A paper describes a structure:
Like LdoA and EcdK, [name] belongs to the 2OG-Fe(ii) oxygenase superfamily, whose members couple the decarboxylation of α-ketoglutarate to substrate oxygenation/hydroxylation via an oxo-ferryl intermediate. Recombinant GriH purified from S. lividans TK24 lacked the characteristic fluorescence of the expected F420 co-factor but nevertheless led to 4-MePro in a coupled assay with GriF, indicating that GriH can use NADH directly without requiring F420. Together, these experiments suggest that 4-MePro biosynthesis starts with the [name]-mediated hydroxylation of l-leucine, followed by oxidation with GriF. The crystal structures of the [name] [name] have been determined in complex with substrates and products, providing insight into the stereospecificity of the reaction.
The canonical iron-binding motif is formed by His110, Asp112 and His210 and has lost the metal in the apo structure. The crystal structure obtained by co-crystallization with Co2+ and substrates unambiguously revealed bound metal and both l-leucine and α-ketoglutarate. Co2+ is coordinated by the iron-binding motif and by α-ketoglutarate as a bi-dentate ligand through its C-1 carboxylate and C-2 keto group (6A and S9†). The axial position trans to His110, the expected binding site of oxygen, remains vacant. l-Leucine does not coordinate to the metal ion but is tightly bound via its carboxy and amino groups. Its side chain is not involved in the interactions and adopts a conformation that corresponds to the most probable rotamer. The coordination site trans to His110 remains vacant. This crystal structure should thus correspond to the substrate complex prior to the binding of dioxygen to the unoccupied coordination site of Fe(ii). In the [name]/substrate complex, both the Cδ methyl groups of l-leucine are located at a 4.4 Å distance to the metal. The reactive oxygen atom should be coordinated to the metal in a distance of approx. 1.6 Å.19–21 With respect to this position, the pro-S group would be closer to the reactive oxygen atom (3.0 Å) than the other Cδ methyl group (3.3 Å), explaining the exclusive formation of (2S,4R)-5-hydroxyleucine.
Numbering used by the authors:
A (entry chain A): 1 to 262
B (entry chain B): -1 to 262
Write the structure that this text describes.
């Protein structure tokens, strides 16, 4: 499981690459059933929307549901991630952002790396985000939007907002881009939203500027994201580290697994 | 009969409930309309609706009564030719609004049909009207375009009662008549979501019973959407109570005469 040379160049130049149809419909069935089961588990890893009606984000489902553990070790994910980072990898973060039909809320414009750098002592952006679509992603159900190529700017420096939106994780709003920055950046780094059927995979750079809008549609948008990190790039927090459900601590190199998810 | 829709365009309107005419107005004409909009946004009065956060204008009514170029627009054969063709009658302005959905958080518009609001609020007898959208901004997937449930006007009016309380006392916000999640879930299989997208100066005609709505605009680009509702002169509202203000519901049923030529 490998990227084509064009796909590697696309990731380098644009900051994201889309692999359609990586997981088959029956594997999507098994994953969605495990998502529905996992959403019922109470705990601090389960983040509700502000309006309280539905789950907004779930952390560390791979520690509770076997299929998500299998997914996280799949060579269909680790092959591409290893090709891009050229190192041994471990799971820095595992989340599913479950954006409900009929009002699932937005995700603020941000970069990921600065959050992990400043909150957790992540030294360098030697990591890759690997999205797995558990819903068809369309123009209508709040797809991730990227500022194309904006990871080439590196980290856009800022201080965290005075008050945190959530005490269960860092909501990107805490490190949100300002309007002035977005207006300047979008002219050089235009908006693009990769669209594809469920089971598709989207790899994207931790310094790409990205965000997503509220989902007004009748269709849910369940988006799984695994952040793989270089084992030699473990966080060095100055204080007590955040919980393991949000920030991984086991830097044992992952060994990939071939075959279907079951 | 100058500005005539083709058979294909009429068929699209009849079957799908909307049709997009790209590039109807030039960049120069769009610029004049955008300058008029910036001026009109500053006019104080009840025709000016603010977003819930008060930070920007959400909607303006009756700009054609204050800005010459919007009066010219409302009489242009590029809008009245198609409207007259679709309705086959003399027309007057039922409603004139500009929904100015600002960059960086301009708010959504609830899923709804237009006709039932006018039927129940104003005594509009029948859906013998057409909505004419004019794009004063480029409309993309990113700046909260109108989304239609394609073909849903063929269901006629989906009956409901207005919400006990109104969101606004300056106009009827569509949320007062919003579609239920159950309705939308059931209907979208047969009437899928579609969003006309096009450069500023394009025109979008749509039926007053099509289900439609729009999302918040998280992008750095504004989305200024002008909508003129033309009504059959024989289909004037017959209100049972005191009529709403003229800035929101037109009363002068004198047939409009279309004009050719550039806006200035
Ligand atoms: O789920 C989304 O739309 C994006 C959220 C995101 O960027 C993140 O959680 O880092
Ligand atoms: O501006 C929009 O997105 C649509 C609002 C609408 O449908 C209306 O005002 O009737
Ligand atoms: C910007 C996001 C990737 C941050 C994430 N929610 C965290 O708490 O680590
Ligand atoms: C549904 C909308 C077309 C109603 C409009 N805002 C009015 O007050 O008439
Ligand atoms: Co992010
Ligand atoms: Co409407
Ligand atoms: Na004209």
């Amino acid at each position: 499981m490998q990227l084509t040379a064009d796909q590697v160049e696309k990731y380098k130049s644009d900051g994201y690459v889309l692999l359609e149809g990586a997981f088959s419909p029956e594997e999507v069935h098994v994953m969605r059933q495990a998502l529905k089961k996992d959403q019922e588990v109470q705990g601090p890893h389960r983040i509700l929307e502000e309006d309280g009606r539905t789950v907004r984000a779930l952390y560390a489902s791979h520690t509770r549901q076997s299929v998500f553990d299998q997914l996280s070790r799949s060579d269909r994910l680790l092959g591409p991630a290893t090709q891009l980072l050229e190192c041994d990898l471990y799971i820095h973060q595992f989340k599913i952002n479950t954006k409900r039909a009929f009002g699932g809320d937005s995700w603020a414009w941000h970069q990921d790396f600065i959050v992990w750098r400043d909150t957790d002592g992540l030294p360098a952006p030697r990591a890759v985000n690997v999205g797995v679509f558990l819903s068809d992603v369309t123009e209508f159900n709040g797809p991730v939007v990227f500022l194309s190529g904006s990871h080439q700017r590196g980290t856009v420096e800022r201080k965290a907002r005075e008050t945190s939106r959530s005490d269960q994780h860092v909501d990107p709003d805490d490190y949100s881009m300002t309007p002035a920055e977005l207006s300047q950046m979008v002219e050089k780094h235009p908006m693009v939203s990769p669209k594809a059927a469920s089971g598709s995979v989207m790899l994207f750079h931790p310094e790409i500027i990205h965000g997503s809008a509220p989902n007004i549609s009748p269709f849910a948008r369940d988006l799984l994201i695994i952040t793989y990190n270089d084992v030699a790039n473990a966080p060095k927090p100055a204080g007590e580290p955040r919980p393991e459900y949000v920030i991984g601590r086991d830097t044992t190199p992952l060994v990939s697994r071939s075959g279907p998810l079951h």
